[PDB]
UniProtKB/Swiss-Prot annotation, chain A:
Changing D65N: In strain: Omicron/BA.2, Omicron/BA.2.12.1, Omicron/BA.2.75, Omicron/BA.4, Omicron/BA.5, Omicron/BQ.1.1, Omicron/XBB.1.5, Omicron/EG.5.1; complete loss of interaction with host integrins. Attaches the virion to the cell membrane by interacting with host receptor, initiating the infection. The major receptor is host ACE2. When S2/S2' has been cleaved, binding to the receptor triggers direct fusion at the cell membrane. When S2/S2' has not been cleaved, binding to the receptor results in internalization of the virus by endocytosis using host TFRC and GRM2 and leading to fusion of the virion membrane with the host endosomal membrane. Alternatively, may use NRP1/NRP2 and integrin as entry receptors. This is Spike protein S1. Disulfide bonds join C39-C92. Binds to host ACE2. RBD also interacts with the N-linked glycan on 'Asn-90' of ACE2. Cleavage of S generates a polybasic C-terminal sequence on S1 that binds to host Neuropilin-1 (NRP1) and Neuropilin-2 (NRP2) receptors. Interacts with host integrin alpha-5/beta-1 (ITGA5:ITGB1) and with ACE2 in complex with integrin alpha-5/beta-1 (ITGA5:ITGB1). May interact via cytoplasmic c-terminus with M protein. May interact (via N-terminus) with host bilirubin and biliverdin, thereby preventing antibody binding to the SARS-CoV-2 spike NTD via an allosteric mechanism. Glycans are attached at N3. Residues 63-65 are annotated as: Integrin-binding motif. Changing L28I: In strain: Omicron/XBB.1.5, Omicron/EG.5.1. It comes from Severe acute respiratory syndrome coronavirus 2.
Length: 97, 49, 49, 49
């Protein structure tokens, strides 16, 4: 999901199923890997404290200027055509160079 | 209007800033409900009086 | 307190996220309007009873 | 126009990408661990190259 050799295109973004495993996101704060890291429906530091039921990861690559429009309710040539997020979306968005 | 109707879920999910906004929305809604309930109960109490 | 008093105008002009906030404001205001109307009607109905 | 009681300036240098995370309620390495601003903090943030 994070360290895969090659992510799929946003045109056909891989649908990854994460289940029956321990989710530990402290690696992001335990090492400087990703420049951009933000959450909307939850807290970045409480992901490990709070346990979810079914976690799903979406991997895609877009232009740098197109990152700002990757969020719930956003519109543009990426949000409304290939990949869209629900307005009530609950999750986090991760980006790095 | 909040993400969830449970204060514990908001506390365990969002940071103090956003958790406070969600809890404020929940408090506003529940306080409006309680004020309406109290007003209607006072009207019923006037009728009972 | 919203940008406009028409839901259709907000939907057409504003994006879904900001349109949702404005529609929530309009709904909230109209809800206190309805609450005030109902309270006045109930008080007048108690007097008329 | 508004005159303050006591003014304290905190001068520090951080990584270029960490400036956007320096504000009340924001999250990040420096913000969360090293230097944090109060959530209800009243003040201004100034940065330059």
């Amino acid at each position: 999901v994070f360290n895969a050799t090659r992510f799929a295109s946003v045109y056909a973004w891989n649908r990854k199923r994460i289940s029956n495993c321990v989710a530990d996101y402290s690696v992001l704060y335990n090492s400087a890997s990703f420049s951009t890291f933000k959450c909307y429906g939850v807290s970045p530091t409480k992901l490990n404290d709070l346990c979810f039921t079914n976690v799903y990861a979406d991997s895609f690559v877009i232009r740098g200027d197109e990152v700002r429009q990757i969020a719930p309710g956003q519109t543009g040539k990426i949000a409304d055509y290939n990949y869209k997020l629900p307005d009530d979306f609950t999750g986090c968005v991760i980006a790095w160079n | 209007g909040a993400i969830s109707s449970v204060l514990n879920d908001i506390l365990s999910r969002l940071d103090p800033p956003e958790a406070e906004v969600q809890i404020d929305r929940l408090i506003t809604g529940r306080l409006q409900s309680l004020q309406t309930y109290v007003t209607q109960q006072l009207i019923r109490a006037a009728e009972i009086r």
